[PDB]
């Protein structure tokens, strides 16, 4: 009784994309499934449902035009054919299957992992990492600038300092380019006497950049 | 269509104790309601069906009542595995989620650590400007963060973003990006972070001068 | 030019305790600075002068100190007469005036009351939609306040207005109107406003249903 | 026995030209040296511009300088501020100070005048529209009902607001006026009583606004 969507996909405005449903451990065709996406910081949203037969399809208002759902039971898989997409598709895709009711009402038990669908469509491009040093207990930072697409992975001296580090969540720029931020605390006298090197690893752009911080004036 | 709506949007609580979220649909949509529950990073797992019936594998401590236009979620004893979102759904119409009601366990009030940081060099050779307000440390989560150019407001320029609650400390992080372009930036001589908390019993302001 | 800055921009106190302002300036304007008085709608009273010299006719309890940059304000015991917004003057490149440090007085902490009013039948026929969302008796002074139609928050849409302490509960009392226009209110049924303050430990938010 | 007595009142247009008269009396004028300083609402205070103990050497501010003029006269002991080509961002509280210490010499200010306002905003005066809150539930659940009245589209200020031609003087709270997008402004008047006090009693808010001259009192009904 579980459910496997796609793992990762990046696409463009207006593009096509799949993503694919496993179902498995339960019978299918019995039942009937639905698309749910959730936005980052938002609350979850119905996208589209389909019979536990396939003979109705049901669609939400804004999504009626550009999306189309379908299903095998004999594969047990269910796909959704995403066409014409927009920045406001850009959500984690959830594949679920009914808790109660047989083939007769849209409760939801079991959810799947969900599938993450990128329309950003912006070049890939290395993150810009530049230091924030300490004044005068002190603090100090580094700052990731202008880099695509998610993730971003950050860690002290190859991850030496793991204690008192805070990694803040990404953000959105009017220029749709991320720019995340990463800072540590540390007593005053052990500033001068030790090194702080932020690595910045990034796998699409393939940019890993070690910077280290001093406090210079 | 029909659009429901939750009460309480962040509710402080603590462990083993009675929890009491109210959703209203603003139609009658009878017995017909679900209640979910999310945790960060994890799929969403269903609490509660018809508002009367539970679903297996599920704890027995919460419970749900209500019918018609008023609902009602109940939990008698809360635990460690109670603190994520919680959305309320009703199938009489467009399929369709509350604004959710997230727990949290900042009981405990602290002052929030504010370190203000002028934007690198780097980035002043790339032409951009970063000024970067730091708050650190802090619970309760709720916050107020103003940029004061010159004794001036700056509104729309400022990025803020909040971490989630930390196990061991429970405490929450909170920065604020203000970015400029190189021309307003060296236009403008100082620089000035306000910060409004709960902790503080003065909000606490911290700033600087361009290029010292 | 210079242009000073000042620390808490809102301090609270209560009589007879020690008050401490700090308004530190850019540049060094040495030991030539002014500290001043403004009651609402009255004109402002010149406290002290040189920041070192009393200016006459002042209370003894005020007194500053500080050199260089660094300047403080420091009152030994607190009075009912002394509570006014207070800003302080530099003259010694460009004269101007900070953003001015105003102290009330804190003595409980209260649940703000809310009270969700909808738009009247006469202005609906103006084609002109307020709604009134009031929060009564509660401080501190300080709250915050969202705005939520059919789920989603409006930001620009909302204006704010606070009236001082009565002296009688000192409580300040907040009001917040949300203006647009007709169609946008019929389209939307459900409206709500929520509320922030620290006397509730749950946000606590007043709705309701078009018509 | 230094007294400042500033002009009362004034309104204009965009644009326009406006003579700000500061009188002084009680001490010697031509001693010492003058100087206007402005408040724009919920603002800081702003230096706008000072002239000297002869009237010579006249200073002014950046943003001021073009079409601003301070001028004094020794012989009447009178300060005129005359401005022309008024814009939005100089609608403020003008007043005419003193030096306190120096003579002459420094930037010092003791002795400031009453205050005089000058509106820019170049908008027609039109009568308040008075929209009644209706009561929000009969039930008492916050241990008093609330009731209020709304005045949108006045102008200018000010507008006074009694209830029961005063009858109803506790539990009011009177907020202050908002700038509005179409520049006309705006206030809000509320009042809590018990609910059982709500069948038995009419509530009534007279509306007072005195340049449109319209005085309007409207009842509270659900």
């Known amino acids: 009784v579980q459910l496997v969507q796609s793992g990762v996909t990046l696409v463009q405005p207006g593009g096509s994309l799949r993503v694919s449903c496993a179902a498995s451990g339960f019978t299918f065709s019995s039942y009937a499934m639905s698309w749910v996406r959730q936005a980052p910081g938002k609350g979850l949203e119905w996208v589209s449902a389909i019979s536990g037969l396939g003979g109705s399809t049901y669609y939400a208002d804004s999504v009626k035009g550009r999306f189309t759902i379908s299903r095998d039971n004999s594969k047990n898989t269910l796909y959704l054919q995403m066409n014409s997409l927009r920045a406001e598709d850009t959500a984690v895709?959830?594949?679920?299957?009914?808790?109660?009711?047989?083939?007769?009402?849209?409760?939801?038990?079991?959810?799947?992992?969900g599938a993450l669908v990128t329309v950003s469509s912006a070049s890939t491009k290395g993150p810009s990492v530049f230091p924030l040093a300490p004044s005068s207990t002190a603090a100090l930072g580094c700052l990731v600038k202008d880099y695509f697409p998610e993730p971003v992975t950050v860690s002290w001296n190859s991850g030496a300092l793991t204690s008192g580090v805070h990694t803040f969540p990404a953000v959105l720029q009017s220029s749709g380019l991320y720019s995340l931020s990463s800072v540590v605390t540390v007593p005053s006298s052990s500033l001068g006497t030790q090194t702080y090197i932020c690595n910045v690893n990034h796998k699409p752009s393939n940019t890993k950049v070690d910077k280290k911080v001093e406090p210079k004036s | 269509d029909i659009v429901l709506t939750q009460s309480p949007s962040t509710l402080s609580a603590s462990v083993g104790d009675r929890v009491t979220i109210t959703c209203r649909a603003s139609q009658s949509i009878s017995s017909w309601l679900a209640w979910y529950q999310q945790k960060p990073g994890e799929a969403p797992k269903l609490l509660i069906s018809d508002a009367s019936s539970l679903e297996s594998g599920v704890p027995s401590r919460f419970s749900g009542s209500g019918s018609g236009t008023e609902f009602t979620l109940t939990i008698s004893s809360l635990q460690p595995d109670d603190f994520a979102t919680?959305?309320?759904?009703?199938?009489?119409?467009?399929?369709?989620?509350?604004?959710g009601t997230k727990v949290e366990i900042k009981r405990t009030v602290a002052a929030p650590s504010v370190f203000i940081f002028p934007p690198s060099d780097e980035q002043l050779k790339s032409g951009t400007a970063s000024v970067v307000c730091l708050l650190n440390n802090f619970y309760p989560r709720e916050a107020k963060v103003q940029w004061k150019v010159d004794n001036a407001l700056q509104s729309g320029n400022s990025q803020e973003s909040v971490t989630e609650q930390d196990s061991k400390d429970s405490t929450y992080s909170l920065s604020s990006t203000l970015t400029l372009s190189k021309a307003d930036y060296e236009k403008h001589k100082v620089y000035a972070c306000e910060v409004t908390h709960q902790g503080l019993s003065s909000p606490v302001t911290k700033s600087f001068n361009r290029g010292e | 030019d210079i242009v000073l800055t000042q620390s808490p921009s809102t301090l609270s106190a209560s009589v007879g305790d020690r008050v401490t302002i700090t308004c530190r300036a850019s540049q060094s304007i040495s030991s030539w600075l002014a500290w001043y008085q403004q009651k609402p709608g009255e004109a402002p009273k010149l406290l002290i002068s040189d920041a070192s010299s009393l200016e006459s006719g002042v209370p003894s309890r005020f007194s500053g100190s500080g050199s260089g940059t660094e300047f403080t304000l420091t009152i030994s015991s607190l009075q009912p007469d002394d509570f006014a917004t207070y800003y302080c003057?530099?003259?010694?490149?460009?004269?101007?005036f900070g953003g001015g440090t105003k102290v009330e007085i804190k003595r409980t902490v209260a649940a703000p009351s809310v009270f969700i009013f909808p738009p009247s039948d006469e202005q609906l026929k103006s084609g002109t939609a307020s709604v009134v969302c009031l929060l009564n008796n509660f401080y501190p002074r300080e709250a915050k306040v969202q705005w939520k139609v059919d789920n989603a928050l409006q930001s620009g849409n909302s204006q704010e207005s606070v009236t001082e302490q009565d002296s009688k509960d000192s409580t300040y009392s907040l009001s917040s109107t949300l203006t647009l226009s007709k169609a946008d209110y019929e389209k939307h049924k459900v409206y709500a406003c929520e509320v922030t303050h620290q006397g509730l430990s749950s946000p606590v938010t007043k709705s309701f249903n078009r018509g | 026995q230094v007294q400042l007595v500033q002009s009362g009142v004034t309104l204009v247009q965009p644009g326009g030209s406006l003579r700000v008269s500061c009188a002084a009396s009680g001490f010697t004028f031509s001693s010492y040296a003058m100087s206007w300083v402005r408040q724009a609402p919920g603002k800081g205070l702003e230096w706008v511009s000072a002239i000297s103990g002869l009237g010579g050497s006249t200073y002014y501010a950046d943003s001021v300088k073009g079409r601003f003029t301070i001028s004094r006269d020794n012989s009447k002991n009178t300060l005129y501020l005359q401005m022309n080509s008024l814009r939005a961002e100089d609608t403020a509280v003008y007043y005419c100070?003193?030096?306190?210490?120096?003579?002459?010499?420094?930037?010092?200010?003791?002795?400031w005048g009453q205050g005089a306002l000058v509106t820019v905003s170049s908008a027609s005066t039109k009568g308040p529209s008075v929209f009644p809150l209706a009561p929000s539930s009969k039930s008492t659940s916050g241990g008093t009902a609330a009731l209020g009245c709304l005045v949108k589209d006045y102008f200018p200020e000010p507008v006074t607001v009694s209830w029961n031609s005063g009858a109803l003087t506790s539990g009011v709270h009177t907020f202050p006026a908002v700038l509005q997008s179409s520049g006309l402004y705006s206030l809000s008047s509320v009042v809590t009583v018990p609910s059982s006090s709500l069948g038995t009693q009419t509530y009534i808010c007279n509306v007072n606004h005195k340049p449109s001259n319209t005085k309007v009192d409207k009842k509270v009904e659900p």
């Open positions: 100070a003193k030096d306190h210490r120096v003579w002459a010499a420094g930037y010092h200010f003791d002795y």
């Open positions: 003057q530099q003259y010694y490149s460009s004269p101007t």
